[PDB]
Design an enzyme around this catalytic site. Structure first.
Site, PDB file in Angstrom:
ATOM      1  N   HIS A   1       0.928  -1.127   0.000  1.00  0.00           N
ATOM      2  CA  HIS A   1       0.000   0.000   0.000  1.00  0.00           C
ATOM      3  C   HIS A   1       0.995   1.208   0.000  1.00  0.00           C
ATOM      4  CE1 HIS A   1      -3.885  -1.393   1.218  1.00  0.00           C
ATOM      5  NE2 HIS A   1      -3.186  -2.295   1.851  1.00  0.00           N
TER       6      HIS A   1
ATOM      7  N   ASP B   1       2.679   1.858   3.204  1.00  0.00           N
ATOM      8  CA  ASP B   1       3.560   0.898   3.872  1.00  0.00           C
ATOM      9  C   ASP B   1       5.008   1.282   3.425  1.00  0.00           C
ATOM     10  OD1 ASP B   1       1.527  -1.893   2.728  1.00  0.00           O
ATOM     11  OD2 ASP B   1       1.539  -0.928   4.700  1.00  0.00           O
TER      12      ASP B   1
ATOM     13  N   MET C   1       1.730  -6.036  -8.003  1.00  0.00           N
ATOM     14  CA  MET C   1       0.476  -5.351  -7.644  1.00  0.00           C
ATOM     15  C   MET C   1       0.829  -4.306  -6.613  1.00  0.00           C
ATOM     16  SD  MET C   1      -1.797  -5.270  -4.923  1.00  0.00           S
ATOM     17  CE  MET C   1      -2.027  -6.832  -4.047  1.00  0.00           C
TER      18      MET C   1
ATOM     19  N   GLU D   1     -11.495  -5.344  -4.575  1.00  0.00           N
ATOM     20  CA  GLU D   1     -11.578  -6.490  -3.623  1.00  0.00           C
ATOM     21  C   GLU D   1     -12.753  -6.283  -2.728  1.00  0.00           C
ATOM     22  OE1 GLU D   1      -9.682  -7.024   0.695  1.00  0.00           O
ATOM     23  OE2 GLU D   1      -8.276  -7.822  -0.755  1.00  0.00           O
TER      24      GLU D   1
ATOM     25  N   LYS E   1     -15.445  -7.052   0.467  1.00  0.00           N
ATOM     26  CA  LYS E   1     -15.379  -7.466   1.889  1.00  0.00           C
ATOM     27  C   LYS E   1     -16.813  -7.061   2.378  1.00  0.00           C
ATOM     28  CE  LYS E   1     -12.951  -7.568   6.335  1.00  0.00           C
ATOM     29  NZ  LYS E   1     -11.879  -6.876   7.190  1.00  0.00           N
TER      30      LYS E   1
ATOM     31  N   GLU F   1     -10.878 -12.404  -1.853  1.00  0.00           N
ATOM     32  CA  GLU F   1     -10.044 -12.880  -0.772  1.00  0.00           C
ATOM     33  C   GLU F   1     -10.718 -14.075  -0.108  1.00  0.00           C
ATOM     34  OE1 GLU F   1      -8.639 -11.431   3.482  1.00  0.00           O
ATOM     35  OE2 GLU F   1      -8.158 -10.233   1.952  1.00  0.00           O
TER      36      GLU F   1
ATOM     37  N   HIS G   1     -12.778 -13.208   3.107  1.00  0.00           N
ATOM     38  CA  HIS G   1     -13.929 -12.262   2.946  1.00  0.00           C
ATOM     39  C   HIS G   1     -15.208 -12.919   2.470  1.00  0.00           C
ATOM     40  CE1 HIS G   1     -10.888  -8.758   2.783  1.00  0.00           C
ATOM     41  NE2 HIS G   1     -10.811  -9.465   3.867  1.00  0.00           N
TER      42      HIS G   1
ATOM     43  N   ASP H   1      -6.466 -13.085  -3.407  1.00  0.00           N
ATOM     44  CA  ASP H   1      -5.871 -12.986  -2.041  1.00  0.00           C
ATOM     45  C   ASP H   1      -6.153 -14.300  -1.264  1.00  0.00           C
ATOM     46  OD1 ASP H   1      -5.741  -9.673  -0.789  1.00  0.00           O
ATOM     47  OD2 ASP H   1      -4.861 -10.350  -2.533  1.00  0.00           O
TER      48      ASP H   1
ATOM     49  N   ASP I   1     -12.464 -10.654  10.686  1.00  0.00           N
ATOM     50  CA  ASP I   1     -11.538 -11.086   9.611  1.00  0.00           C
ATOM     51  C   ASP I   1     -10.193 -11.601  10.271  1.00  0.00           C
ATOM     52  OD1 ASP I   1      -9.804  -9.149   7.109  1.00  0.00           O
ATOM     53  OD2 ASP I   1     -10.440 -11.153   6.850  1.00  0.00           O
TER      54      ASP I   1
ATOM     55  N   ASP J   1      -7.608 -13.483   8.677  1.00  0.00           N
ATOM     56  CA  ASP J   1      -6.415 -13.451   7.902  1.00  0.00           C
ATOM     57  C   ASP J   1      -5.382 -14.497   8.394  1.00  0.00           C
ATOM     58  OD1 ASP J   1      -6.265  -9.813   7.016  1.00  0.00           O
ATOM     59  OD2 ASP J   1      -7.459 -11.413   6.298  1.00  0.00           O
TER      60      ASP J   1
ATOM     61  N   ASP K   1      -2.530 -12.642   1.705  1.00  0.00           N
ATOM     62  CA  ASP K   1      -2.938 -11.450   2.450  1.00  0.00           C
ATOM     63  C   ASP K   1      -3.261 -12.097   3.817  1.00  0.00           C
ATOM     64  OD1 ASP K   1      -3.603  -9.099   3.653  1.00  0.00           O
ATOM     65  OD2 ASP K   1      -5.297  -8.832   2.506  1.00  0.00           O
TER      66      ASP K   1
HETATM   67  C1  LIG Z   1      -4.165  -3.696   2.341  1.00  0.00           C
HETATM   68  C2  LIG Z   1      -5.222  -4.396   1.455  1.00  0.00           C
HETATM   69  C3  LIG Z   1      -5.224  -4.163  -0.057  1.00  0.00           C
HETATM   70  O1  LIG Z   1      -6.212  -3.222  -0.458  1.00  0.00           O
HETATM   71  C4  LIG Z   1      -5.573  -5.577  -0.623  1.00  0.00           C
HETATM   72  C5  LIG Z   1      -4.443  -5.903  -1.554  1.00  0.00           C
HETATM   73  O2  LIG Z   1      -4.857  -7.155  -2.141  1.00  0.00           O
HETATM   74  O3  LIG Z   1      -5.560  -6.396   0.598  1.00  0.00           O
HETATM   75  C6  LIG Z   1      -5.728  -5.813   1.847  1.00  0.00           C
HETATM   76  O4  LIG Z   1      -4.884  -6.296   2.894  1.00  0.00           O
HETATM   77  C7  LIG Z   1      -7.185  -5.404   2.174  1.00  0.00           C
HETATM   78  O5  LIG Z   1      -7.752  -6.737   2.257  1.00  0.00           O
HETATM   79 MN   LIG Z   2      -6.880  -8.577   0.892  1.00  0.00          MN
HETATM   80 MN   LIG Z   3      -9.000 -10.124   5.217  1.00  0.00          MN
END
Ligand SMILES: *C[C@H]1[C@H](O)[C@@H](CO)O[C@]1(O)CO
Ligand SMILES: [Mn+2]
Ligand SMILES: [Mn+2]
Ligand SMILES: *C[C@H]1[C@H](O)[C@@H](CO)O[C@]1(O)CO
Ligand SMILES: *C[C@H]1[C@H](O)[C@@H](CO)O[C@]1(O)CO
Ligand SMILES: *C[C@H]1[C@H](O)[C@@H](CO)O[C@]1(O)CO
Ligand SMILES: [Mn+2]
Ligand SMILES: [Mn+2]
Ligand SMILES: [Mn+2]
Ligand SMILES: [Mn+2]
Ligand SMILES: [Mn+2]
Ligand SMILES: [Mn+2]
Lengths: 387, 387, 387, 387
Positions: free
Chosen positions: D54, D57, D88, D181, D183, D217, D220, D245, D255, D257, D287
């Site tokens: 991002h 980051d 990406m 993406e 969610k 994802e 999600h 993702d 979420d 992850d 992700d």
């Molecule tokens: C930080 C984000 C990005 O927008 C996306 C990149 O695939 O994944 C996330 O972690 C949000 O889910």
């Molecule tokens: Mn993601």
């Molecule tokens: Mn997630």
């Protein structure tokens, strides 16, 4: 047709509720920290009866005894200035990184001893400020994976911790009871004692069960898709509803902590109907978070909405139970018969009763309608004031 | 590398499982009814140890005493011919329209007495056939609306019914215990005693708690999004795991009852790891429904898959616990320390211990990693045989 | 302060709704079948505008052409006697065992051709009776296991079926449009086109997209925990809200089909606010099931409650939008600014605008509160008539 | 029997994944921040092919052009030293308090313009570093209450923003595509375009639909209880699977992850089977968030487990499709017939075909079993290596 709270309604709020800065898993704080003194004064102006606190909301973690005393004196002066009480206190065993695998059930024994010491220090403070209930939320007790926690050993450690705190209270002669608050997940993948039933069953294995009850939270049982009013009736049936956390939640998702009345509004109506009809006399505590989209005006508006919603719901449930037409519907649906013993005559009498089996007309009993929909529409009309 | 069940694995099935005709809320039966005798014989050929039944699966509702005796004699002959046992029996208090508002908690008192009489008749039959456990699933006890059921009166009626059945068993001198099976919803909007914790807490208020335990079902706790292995560890910790219902479920939705191993496969692995490591010695009962897309060949293939999945999972969990590398990882994650008392030294000792607070180095303890991910990947490698 | 429906409110009901006998996965029918003629007459007396039907609710599966004509003549006479209309018709491609693996996406090609023929026969009947919308609910299209259905081939077959029906309609010159109704699961483990978004995206790949829209159902999007009013705003934004199914659902569980207003009451308020403010002019159709606990009196009381709830919600949402204090709050929360283009000035202008970046004061914009809680309490006060 | 990733497997990770400090709604960071350079070097050693980021980051929010250039030069040098690519890039429109009500759909117009400017600055950077896909996650676009957001106006603003970004890309001649993406919730109460279907349908209303696809994802869609592999087959069917993702989630809750392979393991198997059989050739991006219970060793162990799990699943799905016994089972369940057109003969031919209706033997077709359980057990045996 106004609904103004007064200290007599027993409305309470956590310092951490109106004090929530708005930091979430994906974003920074949107509001500056509030001094507890300011929150006491603003809540007293809205009509609240008191406040509650976690040790770290009042005394910044790591404070020296000198700073401690000073934070306490200032708070005490604001309670004296407003007439606000402190009916419940609790421990933060979840924020500091040391609690990453739990407090009472952390795998490292050193952390478990530290958790108990940090809790005992806060019980003495709660007693000094007059709290009658000490809540325990084990938000870090649980796991994200199957091998990380043997659950039977984790319940032995949880039992050990609660038994030691009951030993401490009794040894000091304090008049304080414990209330465990369940939550099914978040922040851990799965949290131990996930629902009101898991907490009630656990209590029955402690050395002095009479010192412990539950502090159910509206949104937490809803995070498991359960009926909150039914779980509360079960805690009332067991004589264990020591305190309650009021808020709103829209279904099975992260813990929203919305103001009371938001979320499932019909569940809010049936909960108020039950608390008032069972005569619950503990605090009506709000464990909520004003959305991060708000400024300070929106914080006070959200806390005021919590109390208002309770009061409107109270009026509608009282009008519902008081309506002769509803009393008639309750009899039509046989609520009066549910309250009578099925067999006060005893087992032998039931066994010899031919009307209970041999001559029971199943088709005639099956054909009787329960008339529940008419009853439910009456409840709907009263909630909406269309009655 | 085959996994063949034998009667010594204690695998059992309900007559209603392989016997499910496939009628669902939206469709007609896709399979013809099976005679219980045929199911006994087919299950014995696959390696099952026994069968279970609801009264109405064995004796068609309304059967005269003459027809009753005849259905029993035929069944008894098939058990004698195959060596199959009947370890558990239960009552159908949900199909007949008379039970539309419940059995033990129906609002009409007449229906509650009838429910008890129908249950007692089946306990005598279960004892005659050798069952050691009598299960109770109150699928119709609950409600779709808030006013239809006062829950405190409903729990008094539920307590009354269970206490009367414990009076009956003790009076007859039978060696049979009761197991309540929880379910959170379906067919009622919300069902009473919705989870293993609600059933365990309720048991503690019966007149003879030692006669009652739980019969948890994999898919039912999953219908509330809860962790099934954690609920089972809690029932084991309380000494109340009397029986268990094995199946699969894909999340929070209608009750699927898929074959065991389908649904949450990692939860299946951790459950088998727990049953085997705790030494559970009751029946491994399958409460499943072969999908309506199947013919009779697919029914037997699905029942055979249930037992196979258990056996493969058993092997992988035993290889996991037996691996020296895993034992080392368990020590690295401090599972050994979770099993040690936090304060066997006692309260006074903990209070005087400066290493538990005054001199505890929080930052050093916080910095210690738990190493749970390495441990979880080891478990993953063993489940997949990539170990 | 009464709320009486009239045919001008456009309230419709399926024959299968008040006609539901009460058979569920665990129990027998609790009510006798109703003749469609009786349902037409009873609904006309309550103020409904019309009825809808699946082919098999009107003509018993397997009827000879002779019996067919007779069922149609009798129905037609009851519509003429009451002035009731038939705005929508649909096909039962889920009850008969032949549809156990689907209709349009069954793996057997013969079944797919039969499904199309059974559907086309019903479109001719719907046109004859005046329906303007033909709904398609593929309740059996989906699977309980991953290998049983290749989804890309299943969408090609689903596209093929819908394109053939659009070819048929256009070839006959009929004025009828199709509406797909999504459902995420039940009776299949997972159903294809599970939500309003999956159905809208699919429509865009048909040969004549203008002939197809969606028929969203309140309880179905709620079975996936989604916000029903947001999904409806998305179907309105796309110009595809052809019809709608109104009911209630308490969360993520089996499909309850409770009367409209039961379930999530605040979602019901926001949905009515949206339908009325967007000017939806199709039928307000109820797809519900009077609980099996009820007799015929409870059936009519439940259908009447559906219409009443809509009318009370309509009044409260209109009072909410009409209140000057609410209009002021909407401006305070910047709803007026959400309606203005972000960059009507164009890309180049935005790129050259220093106030959009280089000189944008982020801290000042961040500090502005949204005032959403005050706005939400106003909405709450209006829903409860405490305004 | 090892499974070692190489850059040829196309495994990618976000800087924010291994870089997650462990701050959650209830706790402080448990790990120190990692410099992006260190993460690039550690990921290259584990066998990853590249990283994603991002804007914030890589460049600390508020950095001057001077510091910006410096953060970029250092990163660029680490990519050159390791051969890592950047396929990406995406924008952080969720952390800073300014985004509290959204980015592209914030109610304040000034914030919407700022969001677009902040995004465009990052597209130029992504192109410079070689990214081919630009992802958009509107985590703050949505609401906690019904009146706060008019959804139709919010979709007009969302359309406007995406159309302006497609105008920008085309005007600059960049070879970059967008992937939205979805969610369903968290951090907002409800998020706009909540699932893959809502995002696919929305894309069809943009001015240049060919520039936009989806970035689904795993966790999600599972947060809405949906089947991830079915949603992916639908994105593949539409030609819109631009990126993906990968992670794990245990059901409907916050979420999580978790590392890929954790969560629903059978869904992971069917997803890998689909990506590999459809020939997906984009990055396999993780992700995920290494649990806060871990130290740096646990971070690398978790990222390594992500790639390993993919590789083991790849082998088992390839062995499954390659087994002659499975090919035979697929034919037995008629997967070959699902792939054939239902009516390549055309509408007229189907209408005149008596074997499709008039003479179709429904009972014979209904009686054919689908043999799906045998097929599913074969898939189970292959996943567990018990084959
Ligand atoms: C930080 C984000 C990005 O927008 C996306 C990149 O695939 O994944 C996330 O972690 C949000 O889910
Ligand atoms: Mn993601
Ligand atoms: Mn997630
Ligand atoms: C901060 C806590 C306390 O443990 C409990 C007090 O009732 O409520 C929470 O906010 C946790 O839910
Ligand atoms: C038919 C029932 C019994 O009550 C129980 C036996 O374990 O399992 C069910 O199938 C209900 O879940
Ligand atoms: C019987 C059906 C129809 O397909 C649809 C008509 O709107 O509604 C159901 O009841 C399926 O939801
Ligand atoms: Mn909460
Ligand atoms: Mn709380
Ligand atoms: Mn079940
Ligand atoms: Mn069961
Ligand atoms: Mn429905
Ligand atoms: Mn419907």
């Amino acid at each position: 047709m106004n609904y103004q709270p007064t200290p007599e309604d027993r409305f309470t709020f956590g310092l951490w509720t109106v004090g929530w800065q708005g930091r979430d898993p994906f974003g920074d704080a949107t509001r500056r920290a509030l001094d507890p003194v300011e929150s006491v004064q603003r809540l007293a102006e809205l009509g609240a009866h008191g406040v509650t606190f976690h040790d770290d909301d009042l005394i910044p973690f790591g404070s020296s005894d000198s700073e401690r005393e000073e934070h306490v004196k200032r708070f005490r002066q604001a309670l004296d200035d407003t007439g606000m009480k402190v009916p419940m206190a609790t421990t933060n065993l979840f924020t500091h990184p040391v609690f990453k695998d739990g407090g009472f059930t952390a795998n490292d024994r050193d952390v478990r001893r530290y958790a108990l010491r940090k809790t005992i220090r806060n019980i003495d403070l709660a007693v000094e400020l007059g709290a009658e209930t000490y809540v325990a939320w084990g938000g870090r007790e649980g796991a994200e994976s199957g091998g990380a926690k043997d659950v039977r050993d984790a319940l032995d450690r949880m039992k050990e911790a609660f038994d030691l705190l009951g030993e401490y209270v009794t040894s000091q002669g304090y008049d304080i009871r414990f209330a465990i608050e369940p939550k099914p997940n978040e922040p851990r993948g799965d949290i131990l004692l996930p629902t009101v039933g898991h907490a009630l069953a656990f209590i029955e294995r402690l050395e002095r069960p009479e010192l412990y009850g539950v502090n159910p939270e509206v949104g937490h049982e809803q995070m498991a898709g359960l009926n909150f009013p039914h779980g509360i009736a079960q805690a009332l049936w067991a004589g264990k509803l020591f305190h309650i956390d009021l808020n709103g939640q829209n279904g099975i998702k992260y813990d929203q902590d919305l103001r009371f009345g938001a979320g499932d509004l019909r569940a809010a109506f049936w909960l108020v109907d039950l608390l008032e009809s069972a005569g619950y006399s503990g605090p009506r505590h709000f464990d909520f978070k004003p959305p991060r989209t708000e400024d300070f005006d929106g914080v006070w508006a959200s806390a005021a909405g919590c109390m208002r919603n309770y009061l409107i719901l109270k009026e509608r449930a009282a009008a519902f139970r008081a309506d002769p037409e509803v009393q008639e519907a309750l009899r039509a649906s046989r609520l009066d018969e549910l309250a009578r013993p099925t067999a006060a005559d005893g087992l032998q009498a039931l066994l010899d009763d031919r009307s209970a089996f041999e001559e029971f007309d199943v088709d005639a009993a099956a054909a009787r309608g329960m008339a529940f929909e008419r009853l439910d529409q009456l409840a709907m009309d009263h909630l909406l004031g269309a009655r």
